[PDB]
Point group: D2
Chain length 349, copies 4
């Protein structure tokens, strides 16, 4: 009896446990956005490490939607060989391969975090002409053709992702990037049908979700990651998230990946173990939409407990899998579950 290691039915899939690798940018792609040797070592290692699902890092649906010049990309058919080999190796190592589709919006074009992370001066786009912070380029507000172009890029990115062998698609609608910035009034001050009211701010994000859902068969889960709150005064709140989650549920979205923050910088975030679990909890229990919990989950007993409480269906792990890629194998034993480990390693367990 450990829910953490009990299969999870999502869409038409059965994940072998409730542990997923959270998407984590590695900033190690080529300038063309191609998979490199780094990702082919990085991701299969965690697959052997025991997660039932790996969500590959934010992958830009167009070059202007990248965070860094070394982000993975999926805007071109020439990304398919590298991406396909990535999903193959993840699957061969025992995990279901998924990928997060993303568009950095007004936060596009920054240096690698360990190279300063400074803006590069790209012609970034967003809902309204408001820069992210000091020194960031002023985003060019999108017109209806621009939004349609990016929507089609998300659609083609999903089609490409499926051709590559990925079986879970997450739309990155969080952390102050393009679609997250349309939701929040701190970054969306538009006066047309796509800003102002809650219904208007959700309009373009829900169009993208609907369009992608239509090209992803029901058997393959479609995730949506959101910042359940932007932690800003008068900004996007949990009640807004619940309203947004109800609409995603009606469109056929399979699971809401509940993160927070990122819309603006100078806001206090009450960091603590499980500090975003209440967001996954509220959505799941008040809307009826499956949720993924993420945020300072580092312990087997902690992960099992939030599942026991009904706060989420899926536990996503980020930083603990950077420093302990085999955490799932050893977590099973910690919970009294015989770990399914590679035969080459059975003598180590």
């Amino acid at each position: 009896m450990a829910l953490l290691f009990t299969p999870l039915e999502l869409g038409g899939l059965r994940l072998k446990n409730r542990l997923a690798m959270s998407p984590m940018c590695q900033y190690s792609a080529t300038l063309e956005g191609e998979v490199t040797d780094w990702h082919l070592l990085h991701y299969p290692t965690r697959a052997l490490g025991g997660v039932g699902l790996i969500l590959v890092e934010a992958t830009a649906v167009e070059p202007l939607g990248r965070i860094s010049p070394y982000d993975l990309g999926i805007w071109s058919e020439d990304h398919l060989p590298g991406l396909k080999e990535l999903a193959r190796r993840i699957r061969e190592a025992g995990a279901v391969p998924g990928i997060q589709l993303a568009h950095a919006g007004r936060k596009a074009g920054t240096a690698r975090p360990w190279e300063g992370g400074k803006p590069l001066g790209w012609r970034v786009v967003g809902p309204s002409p408001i820069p992210f912070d000091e020194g960031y380029p002023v985003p060019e507000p999108l017109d209806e053709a621009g939004m349609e172009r990016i929507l089609q890029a998300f659609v083609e990115g999903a089609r490409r992702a499926l051709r590559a062998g990925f079986q879970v698609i997450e739309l990155h609608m969080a952390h102050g990037y393009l679609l997250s910035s349309f939701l929040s009034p701190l970054s969306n001050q538009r006066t047309d049908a796509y800003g102002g009211s809650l219904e208007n701010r959700m309009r373009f994000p829900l169009q993208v979700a609907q369009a992608v859902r239509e090209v992803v068969p029901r058997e393959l889960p479609l995730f949506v990651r959101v910042s359940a709150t932007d932690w800003g005064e008068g900004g996007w709140s949990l009640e807004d998230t619940l309203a947004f989650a109800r609409r995603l549920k009606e469109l056929g979205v399979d699971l809401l990946d509940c993160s927070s923050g990122g819309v603006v910088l100078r806001v206090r975030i009450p960091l603590a173990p499980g500090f975003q679990v209440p967001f996954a909890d509220a959505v799941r229990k008040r809307v009826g939409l499956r949720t993924g919990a993420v945020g300072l989950i580092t312990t087997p007993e902690q992960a099992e407990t939030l599942l026991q409480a009904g706060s989420a269906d899926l536990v996503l792990l980020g930083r603990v899998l950077l420093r302990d890629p085999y955490f799932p194998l050893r977590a099973a034993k910690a919970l009294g579950v015989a770990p399914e480990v590679p035969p080459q390693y059975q003598r180590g367990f």
Copy 2:
């Protein structure tokens, strides 16, 4: 920001953190129910260990309500000097002293667990003439005068506890003992006003809660511990617990301590970390009564997460404090919280 070590306002008290020592029978009293040297070492150790609240083990309100011949008792003024010294030493070591008033019902009169735990053949009482299991005496069904006698014993037990300096009173209405056995239909098959319907099965337990609430001033929390489910087919369920909780809330009970099981033996209990947290979560969120979570909570991150999720207001620890009495001190440091340790020990932290 670690909710686990943020003070908790309960009634007129401020507990210095959200950690409590769960009531744990020691089977080390005298034959007259007196505090001994064992308790005077056992409990202060855990108060120095850093819990904000210590719930002293099940203390019998009448001799026939004891589990073992070596249970703590509170049926006599003769118990007051030892209980007063116990509360003084707990408080001297930094924790708020509390105590669980109990009546073992049809499970009364068994040997110490490490001495066979076999029934002793007492003239035990219960709701219905049904033995707990093979070899147990058949309970004598209580009449209305008998229930009133035990109710008054709970009232006098509470008054005595307060004179002794205890500031939190918990009523043991869980684990198949007297009041638990009235709640569950597996043990209560009465056809009068105190069995059959849910309202009838709650009647005597609620009468006790109200009578005790009347003699416990508002500043001092009144807890009630319940088996949120008995895990038996057609037995006491979470929905029943919610109904029971709404009635306790109206009576002025401060907090529901959510355990499970113990009513009958041959039931499958899905043990796992936090497996009883969903019961505290449901009561808290759907009734609005504060709850205490307990059951295989062993880790600081796990305990912090369930508080961040809103599943409980208080985390109760049992077995982890038997093997690791200073867990709270080291748990603070693990959460980035400067521990408030005895000056004699600062060099160890």
Copy 3:
């Protein structure tokens, strides 16, 4: 097969395991040096925690030999009732009671560490008129009658300790206190028979060891604690410790407790797990005298390994038992050894 939990024959005793509580000043005695309620809780807690031996903190053989005005003392028959109760409670909780006899020398008369730790200006004594550091009183150099007086105080302290029921006696000859300061040339610049050469600097410490050995029966181990090095240029070194150890062995000392430092302040101490184990290892293997290892031992595997290596016969734990008094109970389980825990606690293991 876990040497850590294999009995240890010392003198006429059998310690039930190779774990001991290292002596740790509590600064909680009365102004007359009496045992208080603090010690009576502090020490039995660790005996229940599973150590086979408890060495009670440095206990001053004369008022002027105290570190603080709140040190334990043993210079009076008036100390016997409290010390006897301390040993009884330690033994009642399963551990052999031992005690460290001490004389603070030129570091005598300082405030409690959490009360500034500043010197109080006592008429302290030492080998040479050299203050420990800025602000400390200049020690009055002892004459032969003065050393004989302190030697007799150590003898009467040992006799008193034995009457109180202590079964292991350790002589504190480390950490810059009186006898340590005679050993080290950084504190001892005498030109008579008790300074200069190594033989001269060992003379008074060895006289004390021999005098105490004479009044401690062979069945009860006599320990000596030493700073195996003072970490100062041209100071007391490991080779000196080996010479000192050979002399202690010939006198009948049972075990050398190998610490370091404390003679002067401005020295670089290479702190790291097990950093003093090489000193216990060298003494044990090159002199053949049993040794106790101490210093940043915090883990069962670490403690078991140094015993498997033959670096020591006894593992002494200090600060880890301040924050985790039940470490030995949980350490047994971690080494595949069924722990022998109080029956009241079996359900926690």
Copy 4:
């Protein structure tokens, strides 16, 4: 101050820390002994995991010297491309690549451990016609031409290893395989110059060591792994190991890797944390030959402690790196050492 993470000078190299990956057969080579995708994921993962040195698994110097049909081989120039890519990837991931050269001797030709491990009936060779156990083929005793052939195979294997880019060579002279079986009298009952006396039994093993040393430049360390004891009555003992180690030292061997057992089955091995550390300790301190310690080392504090004690120069880790490949990165932090982690992972530390 953590010796575990202080550079180690060996031969002409400087390893960046004192942690090495012990050689661990993966049984995942082709039937031709070629490196496969498994090793190219398995080994670089541990290199990123932080070890300063990786000793690649037992690699057979001739097909008959293999343990399984899926062992790595080095008997052919066609092994060089795969082996060279393996060492390149290890080095690119930050670790020095080394390789263990081996000959299974009378234990050659067994199935994979997770496929029964049963003998296959190969024409195995050994010192004397004594089978390993029931069902094992009777080894054909080597003649002087056969020993010379295997010696030359070790020499050519070393030359090939160096051509491939390996900078540390270990000769596998332990665990009852060919050269280990020449040392022990349980398996060597020869009546010529290569059995009987200690000098005779060491003869062929020392010829191999000398021959390999001559083709490995002094700048590149040459290790020799031995079973310091066979745990058998009248068998190879620690005193024999010391005599053998003195001769290896005079030949120019850089480090003795101290294991145990494997010569025969039915012997009791006192398994415990650090149980082979006393062998590395005795060799290092009584012979003056650098040693590697291995055997149930799982903890940073444990590893640091045996280095502090002078029991070994190098800590080798086996099974802990199968279940926790990034142990070295997290061990550094546990010891107060800023870990050198890949920039992509800095946010996880």
